Amino acid sequence: MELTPDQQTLLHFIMDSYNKQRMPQEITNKILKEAFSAEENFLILTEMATNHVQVLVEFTKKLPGFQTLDHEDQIALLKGSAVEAMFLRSAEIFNKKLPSGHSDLLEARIRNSGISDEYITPMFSFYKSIGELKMTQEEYALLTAIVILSPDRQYIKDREAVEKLQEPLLDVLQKLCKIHQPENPQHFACLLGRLTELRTFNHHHAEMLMSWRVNDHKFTPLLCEIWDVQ
Amino acid sequence: KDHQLLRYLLDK
Ligand SMILES: COc1ccc(-c2nc3ccccc3n2[C@H](C(=O)Nc2c(C)cccc2C)C2CCCCC2)c(OC)c1
């Protein structure tokens, strides 16, 4: 039911930390302004992803109790969640309301960005499923935090310590789903359902990057560490 | 050295 004073504090703190990200307009204005080559689009992708990972590390460090975790587990959580968080943020940006015709042009411009056909349908299928859930900013923020604090990540030594940090975020999100969408009592389950779909992008992320219609696939040293490319 | 940049950003 209603959020407690502790949960409201948690929610507002996660919101402020989440709001430090690059604005959706910065990305969409660039894409909608003019059509770029596959080469220019690969560079836009690479800089967007480098800024995303940097901001993600800062958001992750502020997560209550994250700094108390074992340093090797901290690296394993960051590495295991970076691609999923990126796709969750791109899904949020894709679904931000824009003037008439803009979302159709944005979709067509992403389709002709240089990415291989094979990866277009599962990516847009996920974006449209996120869109139908009519998620609030708070839901995206909490869901990102939950993705990062996933105990079921590979190489996690102490799963229980991670579970203790994720549980209060799941409790807040569940209350928010019951408050935002009382007509749909399947909303919380629906949201956790989307998280299971996010994980599939992890498997073929390297191939969707390498299949980009460019001659050279240049990645930054930070991207190489987090994406296991080069 | 496997996650050198990541370890650095995490510690800082
Ligand atoms: C691996 O293959 C792709 C292909 C396309 C996208 C993608 N889906 C988008 C949906 C809405 C808006 C922009 C969208 N992007 C790109 C983008 O910037 N993603 C992004 C990143 C990288 C970090 C933070 C935040 C975002 C949005 C544009 C990169 C330049 C060419 C056109 C796509 C993608 O994102 C995960 C991965």
Side-chain angles (χ1 to χ4, degrees), chain A, chain B residues 2-12:
Chain A
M1 212 177 271
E2 268 225 320
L3 292 166
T4 70
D6 294 278
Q7 293 175 313
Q8 291 190 331
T9 294
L10 178 53
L11 176 65
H12 294 138
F13 188 79
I14 301 301
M15 262 336 290
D16 300 334
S17 297
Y18 197 74
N19 285 328
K20 304 278 181 285
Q21 293 184 99
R22 181 172 278 176
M23 290 302 162
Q25 259 204 294
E26 203 165 321
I27 309 135
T28 55
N29 287 340
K30 208 185 174 80
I31 306 161
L32 291 170
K33 193 178 80 174
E34 55 173 320
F36 298 101
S37 65
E39 296 276 2
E40 293 166 315
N41 281 327
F42 185 79
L43 241 148
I44 292 155
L45 177 82
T46 261
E47 191 281 327
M48 280 292 304
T50 301
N51 170 261
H52 181 268
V53 171
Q54 291 170 346
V55 174
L56 190 69
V57 176
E58 287 328 288
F59 173 84
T60 299
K61 284 163 85 180
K62 285 175 195 68
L63 292 178
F66 188 83
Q67 239 100 186
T68 75
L69 300 172
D70 158 84
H71 294 323
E72 300 322 299
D73 281 350
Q74 283 185 23
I75 290 149
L77 291 172
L78 255 187
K79 236 211 145 304
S81 69
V83 175
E84 282 167 32
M86 174 189 66
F87 277 102
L88 186 53
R89 186 56 176 175
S90 302
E92 177 177 22
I93 290 156
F94 188 83
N95 289 299
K96 281 279 306 311
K97 209 257 159 79
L98 288 176
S100 188
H102 294 38
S103 282
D104 292 23
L105 184 61
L106 181 72
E107 185 175 329
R109 290 257 180 86
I110 292 157
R111 212 166 220 113
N112 287 271
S113 63
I115 189 93
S116 169
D117 300 49
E118 191 174 44
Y119 305 109
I120 289 160
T121 311
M123 188 180 70
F124 286 149
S125 147
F126 175 69
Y127 290 172
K128 288 171 184 182
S129 294
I130 283 293
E132 290 178 84
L133 282 166
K134 310 294 266 185
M135 294 171 66
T136 60
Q137 53 169 18
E138 291 90 1
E139 288 172 342
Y140 285 113
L142 286 162
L143 208 72
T144 299
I146 284 151
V147 159
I148 298 158
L149 295 162
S150 289
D152 51 340
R153 229 44 118 170
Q154 270 216 88
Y155 310 114
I156 295 295
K157 299 174 187 181
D158 191 353
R159 284 198 162 98
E160 187 176 18
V162 180
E163 208 170 354
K164 288 171 187 181
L165 306 184
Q166 196 196 41
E167 280 176 343
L169 296 162
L170 287 160
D171 300 321
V172 175
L173 183 64
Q174 193 162 27
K175 285 195 175 180
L176 253 91
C177 293
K178 287 170 185 174
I179 287 155
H180 181 242
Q181 281 179 48
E183 62 277 332
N184 182 26
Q186 290 300 298
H187 193 55
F188 180 66
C190 287
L191 289 199
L192 297 191
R194 300 284 93 241
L195 289 200
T196 74
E197 193 165 323
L198 254 190
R199 293 201 176 205
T200 72
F201 291 109
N202 269 345
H203 194 249
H204 289 293
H205 182 57
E207 288 158 69
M208 70 195 280
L209 289 165
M210 300 312 294
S211 60
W212 207 278
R213 240 109 276 187
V214 296
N215 307 330
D216 194 12
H217 300 81
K218 282 280 177 284
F219 302 107
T220 68
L222 181 60
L223 286 176
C224 291
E225 278 201 4
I226 212 118
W227 286 351
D228 304 317
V229 282
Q230 274 191 49
Chain B
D2 218 67
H3 313 112
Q4 186 156 71
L5 297 175
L6 227 46
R7 187 171 283 102
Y8 177 80
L9 290 173
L10 249 357
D11 296 359
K12 219 148 83 185

